[PDB]
Amino acid sequence: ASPFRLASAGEISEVQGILRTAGLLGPEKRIAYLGVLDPARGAGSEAEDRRFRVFIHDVSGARPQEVTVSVTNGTVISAVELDTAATGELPVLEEEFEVVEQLLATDERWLKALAARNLDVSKVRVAPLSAGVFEYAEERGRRILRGLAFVQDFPEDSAWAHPVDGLVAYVDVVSKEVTRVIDTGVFPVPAEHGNYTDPELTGPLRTTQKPISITQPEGPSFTVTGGNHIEWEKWSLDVGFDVREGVVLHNIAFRDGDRLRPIINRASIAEMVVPYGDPSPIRSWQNYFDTGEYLVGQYANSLELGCDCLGDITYLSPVISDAFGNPREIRNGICMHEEDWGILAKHSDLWSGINYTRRNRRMVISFFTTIGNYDYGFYWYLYLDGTIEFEAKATGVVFTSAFPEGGSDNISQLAPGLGAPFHQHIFSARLDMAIDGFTNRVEEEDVVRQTMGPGNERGNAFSRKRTVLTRESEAVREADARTGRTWIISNPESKNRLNEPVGYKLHAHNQPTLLADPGSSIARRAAFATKDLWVTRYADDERYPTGDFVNQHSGGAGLPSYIAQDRDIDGQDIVVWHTFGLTHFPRVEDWPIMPVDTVGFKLRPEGFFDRSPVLDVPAN
Amino acid sequence: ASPFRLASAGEISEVQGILRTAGLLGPEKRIAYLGVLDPARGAGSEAEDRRFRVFIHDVSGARPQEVTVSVTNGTVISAVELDTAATGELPVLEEEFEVVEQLLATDERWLKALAARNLDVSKVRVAPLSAGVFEYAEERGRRILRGLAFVQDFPEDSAWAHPVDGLVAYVDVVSKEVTRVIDTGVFPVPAEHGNYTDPELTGPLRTTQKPISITQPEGPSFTVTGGNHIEWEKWSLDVGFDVREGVVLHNIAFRDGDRLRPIINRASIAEMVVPYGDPSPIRSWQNYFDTGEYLVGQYANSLELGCDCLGDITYLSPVISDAFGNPREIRNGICMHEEDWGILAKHSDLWSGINYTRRNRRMVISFFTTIGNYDYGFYWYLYLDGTIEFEAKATGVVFTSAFPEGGSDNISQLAPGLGAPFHQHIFSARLDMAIDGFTNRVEEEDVVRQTMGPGNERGNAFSRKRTVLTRESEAVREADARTGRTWIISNPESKNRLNEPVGYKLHAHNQPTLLADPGSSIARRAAFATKDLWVTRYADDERYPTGDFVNQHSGGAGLPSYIAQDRDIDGQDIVVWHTFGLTHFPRVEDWPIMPVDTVGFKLRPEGFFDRSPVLDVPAN
Numbered sequence A, B: 001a002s003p004f005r006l007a008s009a010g011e012i013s014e015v016q017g018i019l020r021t022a023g024l025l026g027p028e029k030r031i032a033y034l035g036v037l038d039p040a041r042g043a044g045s046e047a048e049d050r051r052f053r054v055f056i057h058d059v060s061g062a063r064p065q066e067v068t069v070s071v072t073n074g075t076v077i078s079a080v081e082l083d084t085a086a087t088g089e090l091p092v093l094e095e096e097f098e099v100v101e102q103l104l105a106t107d108e109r110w111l112k113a114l115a116a117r118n119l120d121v122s123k124v125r126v127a128p129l130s131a132g133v134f135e136y137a138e139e140r141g142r143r144i145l146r147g148l149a150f151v152q153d154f155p156e157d158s159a160w161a162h163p164v165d166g167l168v169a170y171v172d173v174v175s176k177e178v179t180r181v182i183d184t185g186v187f188p189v190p191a192e193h194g195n196y197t198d199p200e201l202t203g204p205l206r207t208t209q210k211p212i213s214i215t216q217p218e219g220p221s222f223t224v225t226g227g228n229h230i231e232w233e234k235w236s237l238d239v240g241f242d243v244r245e246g247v248v249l250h251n252i253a254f255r256d257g258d259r260l261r262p263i264i265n266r267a268s269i270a271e272m273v274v275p276y277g278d279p280s281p282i283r284s285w286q287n288y289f290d291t292g293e294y295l296v297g298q299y300a301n302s303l304e305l306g307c308d309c310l311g312d313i314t315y316l317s318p319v320i321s322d323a324f325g326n327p328r329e330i331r332n333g334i335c336m337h338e339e340d341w342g343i344l345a346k347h348s349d350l351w352s353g354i355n356y357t358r359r360n361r362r363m364v365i366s367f368f369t370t371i372g373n374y375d376y377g378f379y380w381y382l383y384l385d386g387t388i389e390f391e392a393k394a395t396g397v398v399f400t401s402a403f404p405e406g407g408s409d410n411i412s413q414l415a416p417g418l419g420a421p422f423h424q425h426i427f428s429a430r431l432d433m434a435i436d437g438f439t440n441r442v443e444e445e446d447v448v449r450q451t452m453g454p455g456n457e458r459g460n461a462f463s464r465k466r467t468v469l470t471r472e473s474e475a476v477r478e479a480d481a482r483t484g485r486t487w488i489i490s491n492p493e494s495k496n497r498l499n500e501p502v503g504y505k506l507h508a509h510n511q512p513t514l515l516a517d518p519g520s521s522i523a524r525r526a527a528f529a530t531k532d533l534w535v536t537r538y539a540d541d542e543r544y545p546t547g548d549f550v551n552q553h554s555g556g557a558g559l560p561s562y563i564a565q566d567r568d569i570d571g572q573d574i575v576v577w578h579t580f581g582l583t584h585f586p587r588v589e590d591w592p593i594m595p596v597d598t599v600g601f602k603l604r605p606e607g608f609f610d611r612s613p614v615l616d617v618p619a620n
Ligand SMILES: [Cu+2]
Pocket: A394, A398, A423, A424, A425, A584
């Protein structure tokens, strides 16, 4: 019944049928993206209309299309031909990944480079990586992938332990031609294996860990209705899934007494970029847009009970489309459970004699994706006290290179001859805010130090200041950890009982933003990553901080173009875009498989409630 | 057996007997501090010699003494008379706190002030607070507490809801004299109650929370031997307890194959200061040194199973001395347990076909203390992957004032007429480092941005730089979150298999440091709090960043005086002092009892191991 329900297999089958009969899904066609559209802004919107947006690739070389279809009515709403030299290429297709290694295997330049290194071509794996936009004029308007080589000594070997440095190839995956093979010189291929299940490397497994049993004898405290609507400890929300963004949270609201109060209309990780900082021409082009170029939802893992998700787990199994429009279920792709979270509030009062302790809990919604060597967990947390938090967990295998004999300023050494280039992992959270409704504004809050003097004779005073961001041209902000900078999203038309506007405070981790030179290709294409906070006026078609078609787009799309409209954001329907990331100088302990590291952000109530919202939590 | 064992009731009783026999503990004497001294440097040294340090107060006004006793040999090692106007007063005695309200109840100036406000003296509670050092020359050499008043409407009422603003009194607790009563004018006493167990305020309690059961069917994975020696998942350490510092961790080491490798010799929270930022003369003197002035271990809570500590809990019950030298047990004062901690490492490899997931866990050592309205939890965590982390949890009831009718730049409004002054909670962690032994150095690591140009033609490269801190005069450092600044503690004489020095990296939260004007009394007394990181050469008598005697002590002791020695710290026995804290602008949601907020730091291995140290964790 809900317009925010997960897409079903039947809906995807109907989209396939509509496209086929319209002549848009012949045998040369591939679906590169398919997803449901959110309802347009309408508090009186009643008529059910489920619409899907589709990107259609053509393997014969014809122009791709963007298509919108109504599943409810069985109609094509619009279909537009794309000029990819102008607006960007379509996301990378899973089936194009295999093409790179196969094409190189019969290319004479590639074979000569391998023969010089005495490598068997049947043992050489090629990582197919996005191309970006650099100096090669012949690439404009063509779908290019670049390939880096790794040796697999046997079928179960970790090829990441054996990079083939000094070699890179560029491939046109539509015309199926190898455009360039660059061989800058022979580097020894690192010889140690990195097989983390080999007993020779692990040694004897520990026998010291005793079980931790986490159970809910009465079942969980949350309810799931209509497939994806969650109610838990005054929270209300809908859990969506999109093949590009992954888990999306809709309609986050909090039931305060008799009233359901909105907080966030839509929360997602709208882009994720992994830029590499090695100036070698073998890798200086390397930048993954995992969300925009690869689509993180389509590589979501099936999560196994007792290993990936521990406790009383409720699973969702989202459905996506394959390249031909058939539905594909991601079994157990989303874990939902509640977790104990220590002490919530505690006080032992001498004067009253009352001893008071209460425990905290959080609701966890998570999924895990795998893109080549890296694995990322995406965690959303809801706490009893109104806090909302996101956490990304990075693990997997680090991307490797040779370690040059005379050291390096841009690569760390992991093992003899084995390097790991410096890189970042930078996320963009898109928060379509709805603090008590859609009339919102953002204030920047800094600590203010005060000088000893009149009115501050002991030199102890300190204060704070708030600056309203009133237009998009002034809403591109930088962190300042030294002054305790945070941002408050408030509703100027909704006051608490003290006659102050209700609000929520965003607490950032204040990690470094994009390090690349401001003139670089990556700084132009990932402009969102150069600043910590952006605020835009809501618009239906401003979905991603990098634009709709990220692959091989020349730059400037997304947030810089949106902000240029300079719209009023002072008491309006606004969107907060928060950049946050990890700067990774790999350490020896990251090899041969990396222990999890984390980064995130949180939002806490700031005068949203009239007092603590957890006074009604029992002692239990 | 072990020289690091917890003090026993018998040892404390024996110290009492030795002091009495020596003529140092007659009826006029009180023990203000008693604690065990750590062994001096020297592997083995005196086979068994348990020494105790005692601060002895005299209620008749005679000079106090610092005494060191050998309980093993039954001897006083040294006893020195203290000149407190020079070197500082002893810590506040529990029995002195109750003196203040009783003395004020018979003072005509106090009674006149309450009569002007129509307040019944029998309902007025007085919070007795440390005095600091300000402009009052008569206080030099005297033990002073300052009192702020709160109304308690009935015996179970939360007095914190009803501050009596405009009124403060100063009390000499030895001579039992009220030195000054200051009345700057009548403020309305806020009338709303703050009784968080009153059903009128809580509403009906939630019935929605289903139980979470955490059990360990085979018991915990750690062993406790010798009373306080812990072995867990390759970690080895001793859990100490000191009445001033609270939980102290000794001899933190990691079993790497056959070798027990030291990491940290001694870790503690060696001071904590809570400065208030309200320039009202009623509160502009207000600064708590909870560790140095009050002694946080003295006020440790007894922790209740299932409420405070959940799971399979092992308790320690440390013994402290009362003011007369009798042993007092803090029953269940320390909780120890292991916790599941999510995914440790995970990778699904396309080329090898191997899917791999492992789970993390942490060992938790915690205690909670209550000082007046505030309650603080101290948590130490050890993780499977070698990470060490500390977390402070702040809760309790915020300190209140009137909210002035025209508003305030230094006070938040919590309820009608009720304010909460701005303040900070700042901690100093003292880490006596021993990375693979005692020859250590500290490097400051910054990210380095690189300009597009020759050798970086695409403008993507970035790097890092490390700067060795070689002498104490250059080892007073500030955070820089924008450049990703961290500090590495390494052993230049112990190399990993890649011939790089082993190390650990300190990751700070980069919160603001002390905000007070640098000329203020609090900036001089809490100089440690003005900088994020200090490194000193180890010395036996350099224990606290504020010196031995903090109460009513001006500047002149502590870290600024230690650093002046300008000792060599490049490959020497060194101590890291890290300042970290919360800046608290109270919100409505903090009232009437505050949900937990947190701050901390962590240390992660940085080439300490030759590869990931958790390859031998089983799948389960
Ligand atoms: Cu990384």
